[PDB]
Paper text:
Since NQO1 and GSTP1 are phase-II detoxification enzymes that reduce quinones directly to hydroquinones, eliminating the formation of ROS produced by redox cycling, the combination of inhibition of NQO1 and GSTP1 may offer a potential solution for cancer therapy. Though previous studies demonstrate the importance of NQO1 signaling for the progressive phenotype in colorectal cancer and GSTP1 is overexpressed in many cancers and linked to drug resistance, the molecular mechanisms of how these reductive enzymes involved in GBM proliferation remain unclear. Both NQO1 and GSTP1 are well-known phase II metabolism enzymes catalyzing diverse reactions that collectively result in broad protection against electrophiles and oxidants. Using a strategy based on high-throughput chemical screening (HTS) and affinity chromatography, we identified a small molecule NQO1 and GSTP1 dual inhibitor, MNPC, that suppressed the proliferation and stimulated apoptosis in a highly passaged cell line and primary GBM cells bearing the EGFRvIII mutation. The co-crystal structure between MNPC and NQO1, and the molecular docking of MNPC with GSTP1 revealed that MNPC blocked the active sites in both enzymes.
NQO1, originally referred to as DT-diaphorase, is a cytosolic flavoenzyme that plays an important role in protection against endogenous and exogenous quinones by catalyzing two- or four-electron reductions of these substrates. The upregulation of NQO1 protects cells against oxidative stress by catalyzing the detoxification and the reduction of quinine substrates. The active pocket of NQO1 was formed by two enzyme monomers with head and tail inlaid to each other, in which several aromatic amino acids composed a relatively hydrophobic pocket to contain FAD and MNPC. Phe178 and the isoalloxazine ring of FAD formed π-π stacking sandwich with the benzene ring of MNPC. Tyr126, Tyr128, M131, Phe236 from one protein monomer and Trp105, Phe106, Met154, Tyr155 from another monomer formed strong hydrophobic interactions with MNPC. Interestingly, the hydrogen bonding between His161 with the amide carbonyl group of MNPC and the hydrophobic interaction between M131 with the thiazole ring of MNPC locked MNPC in a spatial orientation in which the plane of thiazole ring was perpendicular to the plane of the benzene ring and FAD. Since NQO1 and GSTP1 were the major binding proteins of MNPC, we conducted in vitro reductase enzyme activity assays with purified recombinant proteins and found that MNPC inhibited NQO1 and GSTP1 activities with IC50 values of 0.926 and 0.797 μM, respectively. According to the crystal structure, the existence of Pro186 stabilizes the β-sheet. For R138W mutation, its position lies in the loop connecting two β-sheets. The mutations caused by these two gene polymorphisms are not in the active center and might not directly affect the inhibition of MNPC.
Numbering used by the authors:
A (entry chain A), B (entry chain D): 2 to 273
Write the structure that this text describes.
């Protein structure tokens, strides 16, 4: 791997998030990487999917259906140029870093809208190649999140609940849906209550970690081969896998907890 | 109850989501509700938080920080008028219906931004009044979600994983965190793959449910009294509560699964 894309979702250049992006860019560059940036607020990026993402006539403007229409525009080269420029940043990149503050327990609206406008069907997924088969299966993505709350509020017994459940919709439903290998999220908690000397260390540990990031082991998701990938089956786990798993104590995943215990830190720690 | 707010996040009046919003409005109006709409697309609602949300002079424009500044603005009456207009709608509402298509395993960006810009500190939550003590604790919220994928994809063995995990960050982290009593979601699956007759039954089903919605039992979240709500303890579950829970087979909820089995449909079905 030699190209990295840094997507940043923060309005302030005075912010620690911005500093985390700057630190990632410096470390990667110093290590031989090409780094490309998507500073969404600085790009004044438009996060609202609409029929203006299609450049030209619509297949059915009286019954406008965004996924069908946008897939068709992608095949025919009729996507709004600001989408196309992002899709090509993705195409080029080996590594993708998402640097954002956690907002209402997910990504800022500006970055959520980035997924909805840029991760177009066919380009970012098809139903014939989902999850570990996805188009991005050669790429690696990592979430670098800062929070207001403290680590303990998001421990199994913290008031907010398991961070691993909060991460699941993003890391499995978005990134890994499209084929990304997801690395362990960089989680920096209670950043607005961290003394100056700690913030400095946080930025050093981030830069240190990027020195070898491409070698890391990604999170575990259940492989798509465990499932009957057709409607007649329901995209349910294969009968013989269900059987094999009745014995087992743990679910496979946050999402595939199977009513049993969730493997510890499934969405936070790769398998040691 | 008397007053309903319906927030819709869909660009097309021809969509089933729009029909769901029309149905909800008629059903509640016929039973004597006042009903107000926030059709985000028709409003062309700005979904990006920024310094522009604070009309007038900032407290520290040299280090803009949105939580403190927006809260100050709220207390001093300097929130941008569109924000303020939606906070008014919310104050008057007893019931809030969120009608949206599921997009990348959460809410459309336009609704994510609506939360971010409208659920301001002090207005929508305090350090001192989180979750079941929250400012909206007299109000009831419900999610009305449509999906492309089908129900079995989101069952415990569906390839997508437990829908209960997907709902957690929204229903607990956003609605309940502000004090809402969260009612069972209205989950209409594979709506693009549903014949017209079923479609009409879903609309009628939804209207029939809305005839007694206020009398429904809300979803279960761990009460905040089970937690030491202070930084000294880290907002960890109280000692006596952990002990007493060590002998229980199920966790309390999706977020507080405490490494055990998650109680079935904790986020989809109220407790019997
Ligand atoms: C709408 C909204 C929703 C939110 N929802 C949640 C939620 O669900 N959960 C949650 O936990 N939090 C939530 N938050 C809080 C949010 O996660 C934090 O405010 C955010 O993570 C802080 O990031 P920041 O970089 O802006 O911090 P900043 O305050 O911008 O930066 C932190 C400190 O680092 C300093 N700094 C800046 N640059 C550098 C540098 N180069 N080197 C060293 N120090 C530097 C700054 O001066 C500052 O003192 C929410 C906030 C908003 C606005
Ligand atoms: C960016 C994006 C991301 C997405 N992510 C996901 C995801 O993560 N998971 C997922 O499951 N899905 C996802 N989807 C799919 C999405 O959930 C569905 O495509 C959407 O719910 C379709 O609903 P609709 O309101 O647009 O109905 P339409 O697709 O517009 O139409 C549905 C049917 O309802 C009929 N109808 C309309 N009005 C009425 C009426 N009044 N009475 C009777 N019939 C009527 C229409 O004739 C049509 O046959 C995504 C879609 C997009 C664009
Ligand atoms: C600190 C801090 O910074 N941002 C947030 C936040 C803002 C919006 C949504 C979610 C989190 C936050 C915080 O979590 N305060 C409270 N949560 C647990 C506490 N309690 O139990 O009382 S105090
Ligand atoms: C149908 C349908 O409609 N919208 C979506 C969707 C679009 C973006 C993100 C998530 C869902 C969708 C769908 O999920 N098809 C796949 N589900 C499991 C399948 N598999 O395992 O192969 S095929």
């Amino acid at each position: 791997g030699r190209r990295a894309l840094i997507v940043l979702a923060h309005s302030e250049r005075t912010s620690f998030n911005y500093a985390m992006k700057e630190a990632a860019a410096a470390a990667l560059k110093k290590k031989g990487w090409e780094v490309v940036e998507s500073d969404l607020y600085a790009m004044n990026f438009n996060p609202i999917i609409s029929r203006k993402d299609i450049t030209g006539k619509l297949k059915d403007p009286a019954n406008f259906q965004y996924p069908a229409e946008s897939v068709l525009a992608y095949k025919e080269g009729h996507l709004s140029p600001d989408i196309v420029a992002e899709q090509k940043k993705l195409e080029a990149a080996d590594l993708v870093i998402f640097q954002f503050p956690l907002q209402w327990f997910g990504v800022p609206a500006i970055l959520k809208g980035w997924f909805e406008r840029v991760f177009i069907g066919e380009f970012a997924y098809t139903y014939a190649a989902m999850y570990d088969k996805g188009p991005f299966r050669s790429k690696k993505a990592v979430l670098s999140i800062t929070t207001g709350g403290s680590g303990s509020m998001y421990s199994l017994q913290g008031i907010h609940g398991d961070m691993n459940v909060i991460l699941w919709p993003i890391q499995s439903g978005i990134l890994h849906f499209c084929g990304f290998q997801v690395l362990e999220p960089q989680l920096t908690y209670s950043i607005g209550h961290t003394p100056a000397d700690a913030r400095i260390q946080i930025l050093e540990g981030w830069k240190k970690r990027l020195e070898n990031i491409w070698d890391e082991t990604p999170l575990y998701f259940a492989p798509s081969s465990l499932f009957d990938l057709n409607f007649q089956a329901g995209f349910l786990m294969k009968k013989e896998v269900q059987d094999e798993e009745k014995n087992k104590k743990f679910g496979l995943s946050v999402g595939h907890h199977l009513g049993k215990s969730i493997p510890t830190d499934n969405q936070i720690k790769a398998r040691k």
